[PDB]
Each structure stands twice: as C-alpha cells, then as structure tokens.
Design a protein around this ligand. Sequence first.
Ligand SMILES: [Zn+2]
Length: 463
Amino acid sequence: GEIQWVKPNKETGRLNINGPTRTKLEPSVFHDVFEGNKEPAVLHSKDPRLEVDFEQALFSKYVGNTLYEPDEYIKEAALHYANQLKQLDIDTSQMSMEEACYGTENLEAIDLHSTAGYPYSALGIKKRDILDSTTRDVSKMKFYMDKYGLDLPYSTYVKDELRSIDKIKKGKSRLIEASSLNDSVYLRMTFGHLYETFHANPGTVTGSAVGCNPDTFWSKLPILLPGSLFAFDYSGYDASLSPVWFRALELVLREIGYSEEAVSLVEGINHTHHVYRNKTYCVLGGMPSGMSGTSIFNSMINNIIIRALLIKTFKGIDLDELNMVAYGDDVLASYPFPIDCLELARTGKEYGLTMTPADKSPCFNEVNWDNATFLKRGFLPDEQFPFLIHPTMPMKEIHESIRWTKDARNTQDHVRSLCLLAWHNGKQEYEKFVSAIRSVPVGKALAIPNYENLRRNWLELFH
RNA sequence: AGGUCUCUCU
RNA sequence: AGAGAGACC
Ligand SMILES: [Zn+2]
C-alpha cells in the first residue's frame, strides 16, 4: 500500500470526519492485582507519551508497493486456489438487497450500532432511520443508494484499545477505515453468498477460519493440518499488500465464475480514498480495514500468497499437499516435508511482504503443535481425552485485559468472558486466577464460573 | 469506534 | 427478536 496524495477537504469537497479524542479505558479495580504493561493507544497528536510525530506514525504502515501485475507463480497460485474453491459451489449470483441488509443463516444482518460511514455520519442520518428489522425495508435504502451512489470515501478513525508500551511511544495506533453503508450493501449484494459459504465452512477447503469457534475448531486442526507445520508473522500485512494481490484476487473470482461486473469491484478496493479529520487522501494497494468483507478477502489473498511463495521459493512443491487456514493475516499451514520460512520470508520481501518468525525471536525456529499459535491461542491436548484440543490463551494476555475497563458497570461480564478463555490453561492456573480476582472486595461480589462446570460444558460440545 | 466468535440481560 | 460486554483478526 502507498499513499498517492493528500489534499485539504476544501480542495476535494468532502465533509470533515472527526473522531473521539480521549480513551474510554480507565484502570479497573483489578489494575494493581495483576501485572501488565499495556495502556490505551495514543489517540491525539498532543498525547504527552508520544516520542514521535503522531500522524507520521499513523500512516507509516503504508510501506510502498512493489509488483503491480501477476507473474507466473502468482498466476499458478491463484488458479490452484480457485480450483480448490470450486468444490464449494459458491453461488456467484447477486444476493438480494433484503438478504444483504437484514441477514441470512450464515450472514449476520448489518449491525445497526456500527457506523453508517460517509456521508451519513457527517449529516446525522442514522442507520436506524433507513433500515428496519421488523419491516425488512429496502425502500429508503434503494433511494439513498441512488442519492449518494457507490465508491464513497472510507472514514478513518483511530482505534481505542490497549497497546504495548513501545507502540505508544512510537505512535503506532491502529486505524478503522469504515466503509460507507452504500458500499457495504453493494459488496454484501455482490459477494454475500460467498460470505455465507466461508462463514459456514471454516477449514482447509476455504483456507479460512473466519466464522470458526476455537472451543471446537481446535480439535479439528491437527487433523486438517497433517504433516509438518509452518507459520510466521507479517508486519503490517493489510497495508503492505501491493496491487498485484488484488489482481490475483480478480483471477480467483473470475475463475470460480463471477461476472465481470462483480470482478470489477476489486479495483475499488485496491484504489481507495479516505477522509481523516479535515483531509482527503488516496491509497493505492493495501486492504481497507473496515470494509465489508475485509477478513475474508485478506484470508483469500493469503491463500494466494502462501501458494505463490511456496512454488517460487522451492523446486518440486506439490500444492495439493499444502494444507492451510488463514484468518486475515494469521496463518497456520502444513506440508508433508518441512518448509523453511527463512527462505519463504526472503521470497516474501520481493513481493513487498515483511515476514518474521512465529516465536517472535529473530530465528525462524521449528513450529510444532507444542508451540504453534493461531488467533493468539496455543494447542493443548486434554489430559483425559487427548483427541480433544484446548485453545490456550496466555494468562499474560488475560492479565492485561482485566486491568482495564471501558464501563465498570459490566465488570461481571468482562470477568466471566476472561474466565471462559482462562480455564483452558488448566485447573491450577484457573484457580490461581480466581483467587487473585477474589482478593479484592469487588472480586468477592462476582459470580465466577466454576472450573468443573466449564470443563463439562466444553466436553458436551463434542458429546 | 470494521467483521468473526463467545457470553450476559430483557 | 431487542440491549450490552469480552476476546481475536
Ligand atoms: Zn485516488
């Protein structure tokens, strides 16, 4: 991704997009009970903790673009993945606006508390005044579609969330690039059936884990991913995508039978305009963060990427022996023989991709079931039933979460959610967690799940 | 203040 | 179905 220009909103004629300036996160009653280093992300250029210019840091993620058109390896990768997708029989026909607005079995209805985007946010029109769940009304929608059209700018807001200390010093807050309601609708109409298919079929046919539930999906993954594992991390995956990967996405969509009218929506993703505060800017390459379908297209692109990297890096790769699942940039993959990611990362650099070892060290060490992580969780076989696999979230990350709150009124829900994550680490660690919670008066006031009930509820998911 | 999953409350 | 929360990407 690369920013092509920046202009004042007077010159472009766009309405200003202002976002909140102060965090909703304050220390919780557990802030001193548990260790942690994270704090709310810098949200304002005048944050005292900054040690860099804020807006420079905000847009450094756009590292540039290298390739613009597919080479042989990317072509073969794209075609191999699309062929794999054929066995899913995706309905490449346009989904209805009513289905696209109000939802189906495998596609959530448009969230009515998520923003409407440009220009609706600026001119006060609310999503509640245009869509009605009881009515399944597309009347006003069709109007505002005709009124404001498509290819509207994405509205840029900084994300209010915890971040590590180095990321606060360095200004590295994350951005939400919220699509406009009209483009959500058009994208959900064009690809909603594909979204349905992916959501219902997390695994190694889609190559996607969007829609997975880790409590149950973890037990499938060692069977879906036989052989030797490989994985690695990206730095700034979304922002580092060169336009070649959106060309490659077009290859995939066409080969599984999408119309050229549908395939043509991809250039509107590759080339996007954003309003942040009082400025407009153009972005060439790079996936927009808050687009309808961001995770699914990131995940498909990743399937193209891993295949290409394999067949360009090594001789004799049989892509039919690759197994992988991606959630956006996060990837876990396997192959009958070990894969050297040091060499994959070298090839990745040529494509404009920055790939680093999965263990966060400087060396690409072996990835096995005992150290692999996906969606930040490890893999722990149950002591009683070793075919059942616990997704294990590090207590360190749960410790960081519980030290802060956005509304202390829901302390109960917050602690319960963390408990549903924490018990997978075992009885002793869980009871150490609960004891620490209860060492504090608000802690003795909470209904806290008992470990044996958690375990039994999880076992029952498999019967 | 984008999605996915999970939980909670009418 | 209506309101909320948390985690992850
Ligand atoms: Zn432009």
